[PDB]
Design a protein around this motif. Structure first.
Motif, mmCIF file in Angstrom:
data_model
loop_
_atom_site.group_PDB
_atom_site.id
_atom_site.type_symbol
_atom_site.label_atom_id
_atom_site.label_comp_id
_atom_site.label_asym_id
_atom_site.label_seq_id
_atom_site.Cartn_x
_atom_site.Cartn_y
_atom_site.Cartn_z
ATOM 1 N N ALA A 46 0.847 -1.186 0.000
ATOM 2 C CA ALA A 46 0.000 0.000 0.000
ATOM 3 C C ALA A 46 0.886 1.241 0.000
ATOM 4 O O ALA A 46 2.103 1.164 0.200
ATOM 5 C CB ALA A 46 -0.956 0.012 1.196
ATOM 6 N N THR A 47 0.258 2.404 -0.188
ATOM 7 C CA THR A 47 0.998 3.665 -0.269
ATOM 8 C C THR A 47 0.182 4.773 0.402
ATOM 9 O O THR A 47 -0.820 5.248 -0.141
ATOM 10 C CB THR A 47 1.373 3.991 -1.716
ATOM 11 O OG1 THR A 47 1.815 5.353 -1.823
ATOM 12 C CG2 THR A 47 0.252 3.671 -2.724
ATOM 13 N N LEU A 65 0.942 1.159 12.921
ATOM 14 C CA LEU A 65 1.300 -0.112 12.290
ATOM 15 C C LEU A 65 1.804 -1.144 13.291
ATOM 16 O O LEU A 65 1.554 -2.343 13.121
ATOM 17 C CB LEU A 65 2.328 0.121 11.186
ATOM 18 C CG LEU A 65 1.785 0.776 9.921
ATOM 19 C CD1 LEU A 65 2.791 0.620 8.830
ATOM 20 C CD2 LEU A 65 0.533 0.040 9.506
ATOM 21 N N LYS A 66 2.522 -0.714 14.331
ATOM 22 C CA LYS A 66 2.837 -1.648 15.412
ATOM 23 C C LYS A 66 1.579 -2.076 16.164
ATOM 24 O O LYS A 66 1.478 -3.233 16.600
ATOM 25 C CB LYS A 66 3.868 -1.067 16.381
ATOM 26 C CG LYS A 66 5.124 -0.514 15.747
ATOM 27 C CD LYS A 66 5.836 -1.568 14.920
ATOM 28 C CE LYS A 66 7.109 -1.011 14.310
ATOM 29 N NZ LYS A 66 7.053 -1.011 12.822
ATOM 30 N N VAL A 84 0.343 -9.910 11.272
ATOM 31 C CA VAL A 84 1.242 -9.622 10.153
ATOM 32 C C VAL A 84 2.439 -8.808 10.634
ATOM 33 O O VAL A 84 2.479 -8.330 11.770
ATOM 34 C CB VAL A 84 0.565 -8.864 8.977
ATOM 35 C CG1 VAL A 84 -0.794 -9.414 8.594
ATOM 36 C CG2 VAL A 84 0.324 -7.442 9.413
ATOM 37 N N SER A 85 3.440 -8.682 9.761
ATOM 38 C CA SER A 85 4.544 -7.749 9.942
ATOM 39 C C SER A 85 4.471 -6.646 8.891
ATOM 40 O O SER A 85 3.983 -6.862 7.777
ATOM 41 C CB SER A 85 5.896 -8.460 9.847
ATOM 42 O OG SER A 85 6.082 -9.009 8.555
ATOM 43 N N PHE A 86 4.968 -5.462 9.249
ATOM 44 C CA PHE A 86 4.936 -4.290 8.379
ATOM 45 C C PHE A 86 6.364 -3.809 8.157
ATOM 46 O O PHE A 86 7.091 -3.559 9.125
ATOM 47 C CB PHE A 86 4.116 -3.150 8.990
ATOM 48 C CG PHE A 86 2.623 -3.335 8.908
ATOM 49 C CD1 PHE A 86 1.919 -2.991 7.769
ATOM 50 C CD2 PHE A 86 1.916 -3.768 10.015
ATOM 51 C CE1 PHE A 86 0.540 -3.136 7.712
ATOM 52 C CE2 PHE A 86 0.544 -3.907 9.973
ATOM 53 C CZ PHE A 86 -0.146 -3.595 8.816
ATOM 54 N N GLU A 87 6.769 -3.670 6.896
ATOM 55 C CA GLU A 87 8.033 -3.028 6.558
ATOM 56 C C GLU A 87 7.750 -1.738 5.797
ATOM 57 O O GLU A 87 6.954 -1.721 4.848
ATOM 58 C CB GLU A 87 8.940 -3.967 5.754
ATOM 59 C CG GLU A 87 10.437 -3.998 6.155
ATOM 60 C CD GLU A 87 10.754 -4.549 7.559
ATOM 61 O OE1 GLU A 87 11.956 -4.603 7.896
ATOM 62 O OE2 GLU A 87 9.853 -4.977 8.311
#
Length: 96
Positions: A46-47, A65-66, A84-87
């Motif tokens: 996403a953006t 996001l955390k 999930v994980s977020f980068e």
RNA sequence: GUUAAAACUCUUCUCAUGCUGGAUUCGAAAUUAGGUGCGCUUCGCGUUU
């Protein structure tokens, strides 16, 4: 906030699954249903677009996001679905 | 500067139940506790009529 579109297709991440409801005395399946999920290790993108940038913007988005990494994204969040994980990468654009 | 903007298809529900790695096949086939060593050494059937 754009939709988290996937990088892969339906035939490569989406599987149908048997979810269940079991009785507590007979210990056998009372109700069965078929729900679709996305496999683990599936990369979505996403953006986010914050115009008029304040100083506490990227940090707040990362904090949220955390909070999403620990609670989950989507539905059926209490039974374990959605962790999930977020980068994250960031970029200001000035001239075109 | 889009009949806009604002509003997460969300909540609830264990792939569970039923099924024993079981059946067949002998640690036994070959190998003498055998070989060496003398119950020997010492003592008169006396005496007595």
């Amino acid at each position: 906030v754009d939709f988290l579109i996937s990088n892969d297709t339906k035939e490569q991440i989406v599987r149908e699954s048997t979810h269940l409801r079991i009785e507590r005395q007979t210990k056998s399946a009372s109700d069965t249903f078929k729900g679709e999920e996305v496999i683990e290790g599936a990369t979505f993108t996403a953006t986010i677009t914050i115009s008029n940038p304040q100083e506490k913007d990227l940090s707040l988005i990362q904090s949220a996001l955390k909070f999403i990494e620990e609670n989950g994204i989507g539905g059926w969040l209490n039974k374990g679905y959605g962790r999930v994980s977020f980068e994250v990468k960031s970029e200001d654009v000035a001239t075109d």
